[PDB]
Design a binder for this molecule. Structure first.
Ligand SMILES: *[C@H](CC(=O)OCC)[C@H](C[C@@H]1CCNC1=O)NC(=O)[C@H](CC#C)n1cccc(NC(=O)c2cc(C)on2)c1=O
Ligand SMILES: *[C@H](CC(=O)OCC)[C@H](C[C@@H]1CCNC1=O)NC(=O)[C@H](CC#C)n1cccc(NC(=O)c2cc(C)on2)c1=O
Lengths: 302, 302
């Protein structure tokens, strides 16, 4: 019945994306009740990037210094504070399109949809995963900062990402909605590097479980193996190692397909060794690891 | 700055997705002003699939025979007609969340976002392209029919797709919002086949133009070639042939990168002949053809 990388619907978040300008510099922010969250680097000038004192740069501002527009209509600011790497700006008006929501801090290999925005307007939406090295392989132009990542859960919106910046390799770094960065990164134009990235092993498996449910069984083999043998191979190929928790978590997809997590791992193990022979799994010629167990069922079961 | 497959934001459409039940059978429909469009096969029973008389099956129904719920609140039906392969159901109430909109009939290789829905609720959103053989490689479970495809253009929503059914290969068929199918397909459980599929040549190019703007130039070469030589190779590899219109259309990305459409085609030509040597373009190990010229700029320029 098909397997696509698919995002959550964006409407609920769309109604929360306001424009924040401070002096000249203009980026997106998130409007939940009478707060507007945006990156603190909104207060920076082109120079205040190599080495900026935020606490200081900010002590040189007031509520009226910041301009917040919903589509075209300004919100009057009445409070402005620093929340780690964000600004928490109080506003005269509380958002009428504010959904049920929570702020969460996703673990690496966990996924979220990004809503890419410019001057407060949403430009598009795509799925991605939080890398082990604590990065994102997003698509983000200049003015994209403030753009958010989120998981929906019925009518509840869980915010997990706000975009701050791009790193050397061409990869993206940002923070939770508590303004606390992901990985060891800082809001400055210094030379910072993402660590070496591993492959999210659990996700790769879930993706085979999905290939199977989608009638794609070629790479299946008879061989089994122990978590122990498999972990030795995983290290070679820079795969994140498998914890029994992970195998328990694949239980539902395991039972659902009548393939034992460890039988599947044996199939993977082989693929890591025996290439793919220019075949395709679900149409991919590489091992997709941006799909959680949860992603897989949700799509393949309701 | 990154290149992702990204959908348009779904909010505008989200507010248009109602549940339509007729007897037992329950699928999604689209609520624009006081009309509800849904597939006509809503009126079918499990048996009325191999060979159903719709005009007849429908002549055996009235306005109250159909149940339309917005989230949970019923819309009173006051008119029910057949619009080719859709139903046009009139309702007591006009939709308060109806956007500016038009109904268009995209050409093959043109793309749209799909909003996958179940019992009137949106489940997720993904980009795809209308294949040359007039199919879609979507992800669609049972109850997904009624789900729509669309292009946004500032605040205007252009509807181009409604989902009717799956075909042998694992591919998806449906219609425009005039109820007129795409390709030679019919709303019946007969054996219908998609033609052989070609590769959307223009899109493959735009995707290299994007790889280039995203600092990915390895596959570039010195060789040029004429539209004529390139078309001969295209046929071999089941690529859709290049019309000068197509090359004119790549003009903006051409100028934008200082690579001449025909210089780029020469690079492609080579790739079709000289594999990829297990390299990646924009991280893909195959030639991506689900990206229009227009898709490419929009993402890489605002
Ligand atoms: C924020 C955009 C925004 O809205 O703010 C301006 C109004 C951007 C997002 C970037 C632009 C390109 N791609 C992105 O993801 N972030 C920045 O530009 C940050 C600002 C902060 C903090 N920033 C500032 C200065 C330099 C850099 N870049 C690098 O450090 C860097 C080094 C290498 C190599 O590649 N990038 C940066 O992200
Ligand atoms: C519509 C789902 C819906 O909401 O209607 C039921 C309430 C589905 C969408 C399908 C389900 C699985 N994947 C999809 O994209 N469409 C149908 O099930 C249609 C109905 C019509 C018209 N339909 C009916 C009967 C058979 C088939 N399938 C095939 O013809 C077929 C043959 C092979 C091989 O694979 N599929 C069908 O789509």
């Amino acid at each position: 019945s098909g397997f696509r990388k698919m995002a959550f619907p964006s409407g609920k978040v769309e109604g929360c994306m306001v424009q924040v300008t401070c002096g000249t510099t203009t980026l997106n922010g998130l409007w939940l009740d009478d707060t507007v969250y945006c990156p603190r680097h909104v207060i920076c000038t082109a120079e205040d990037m190599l080495n900026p004192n935020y606490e200081d740069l900010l002590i040189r501002k007031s509520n009226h210094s910041f301009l917040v527009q919903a589509g075209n209509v300004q919100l009057r600011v009445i409070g402005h504070s620093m929340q780690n790497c964000l600004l928490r700006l109080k506003v005269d008006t509380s958002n009428p399109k504010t959904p049920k929501y929570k702020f969460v801090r996703i673990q690496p290999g966990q996924t979220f949809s990004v809503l890419a925005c410019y001057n407060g307007s949403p430009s598009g939406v795509y799925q991605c995963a939080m890398r082990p090295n604590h990065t994102i392989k997003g698509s983000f132009l200049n003015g994209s900062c403030g753009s958010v990542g989120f998981n929906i859960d019925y009518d509840c919106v869980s915010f997990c990402y706000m975009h701050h910046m791009e790193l050397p390799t061409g990869v993206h770094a940002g923070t939770d909605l508590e303004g606390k960065f992901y990985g060891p990164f800082v809001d400055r134009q210094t030379a910072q590097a993402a660590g070496t990235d591993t492959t999210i092993t659990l996700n790769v498996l879930a993706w085979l479980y999905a290939a199977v449910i989608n009638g794609d069984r070629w790479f299946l083999n008879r061989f089994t193996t122990t978590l122990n043998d498999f972990n030795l191979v995983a290290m070679k190929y820079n795969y994140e190692p498998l914890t029994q928790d992970h195998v328990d978590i694949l239980g539902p997809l395991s039972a659902q397909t009548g393939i034992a997590v460890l039988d599947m791992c044996a199939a993977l193990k082989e693929l890591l060794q025996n290439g793919m022979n220019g075949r395709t799994i679900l149409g991919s010629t590489i091992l997709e690891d941006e799909f959680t167990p949860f992603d897989v069922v949700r799509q393949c079961s309701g």
